[PDB]
DNA sequence: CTGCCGAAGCGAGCACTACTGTCACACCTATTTTAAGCCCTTCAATCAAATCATCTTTTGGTTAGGATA
């Protein structure tokens, strides 16, 4: 399940400990990094926009704090 | 016509802050030579703090990779 992952480098059987392979797992990982999107996200980012955005100007970045999955 | 002696208030002895004449011995430095320690200048050799140049990491934003709604 993505989870317990000293187990994982463990069993892996490659000396890997648990902080490498979910580094590497997460960089190369399809459901953290979206390419889709979701009706919560969309909802809570158009929130956090209306809220903050002054003209032209909006935390593209920051926003990432709320949302999980991007960067 | 001049002259003596009392009443009261004064008094004593005991209680099982610096000058000045001298005077010779003190002070004073002419030079010799070491063996380890010296103060201050004075610039030159060396180092590290500060600055500038440029590459890199993340926001704003675009290109066009990539996408929803």
């Given at each position: 399940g993505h989870l317990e992952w000293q187990k994982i480098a463990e069993e892996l059987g490659?000396?890997?400990?648990?902080?490498?392979?979910?580094?590497?797992?997460?960089?190369?990982?399809?459901?953290?990094?979206?390419?889709?999107?979701?009706?919560?996200?969309?909802?809570?980012?158009?929130?956090?926009?209306?809220e903050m955005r002054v003209g032209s100007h909006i935390p593209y970045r920051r926003i990432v704090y709320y949302m999980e999955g991007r960067d």
């Open positions: 490659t000396s890997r400990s648990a902080f490498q392979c979910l580094q590497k797992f997460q960089q190369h990982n399809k459901a953290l990094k979206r390419k889709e999107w979701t009706e919560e996200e969309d909802r809570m980012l158009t929130q956090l926009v209306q």
